[PDB]
Design a protein around this ligand. Structure first.
Ligand SMILES: [Zn+2]
Ligand SMILES: [Zn+2]
Lengths: 49, 49
């Protein structure tokens, strides 16, 4: 096992904080808060032109 | 300016790839693909008990 960084409280790829609640795409972890933040940030699909 | 890592193609906090399309919460960047991936992964709110 030398690829995926698991850890007990997975460190938030965003917050840099060790959290046990969130998701994991590849080997990383977006904390559940950021995980919702993202959905909330992406709400700008159209451009400003 | 010594806090936020901008860069031209913001590196995906997930893919480790330099992408100009995606979001940014704090100082990081989830590529737009991962940004959708997350929403898709979080669809497991209830527990397996
Ligand atoms: Zn976070
Ligand atoms: Zn990505």
């Amino acid at each position: 096992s030398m690829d995926e960084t698991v850890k007990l409280n997975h460190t938030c790829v965003i917050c840099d904080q060790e959290k046990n609640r969130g998701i994991h795409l590849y080997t990383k972890f977006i904390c559940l808060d950021c995980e919702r933040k993202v959905i909330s940030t992406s709400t700008s699909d159209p451009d400003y032109a």
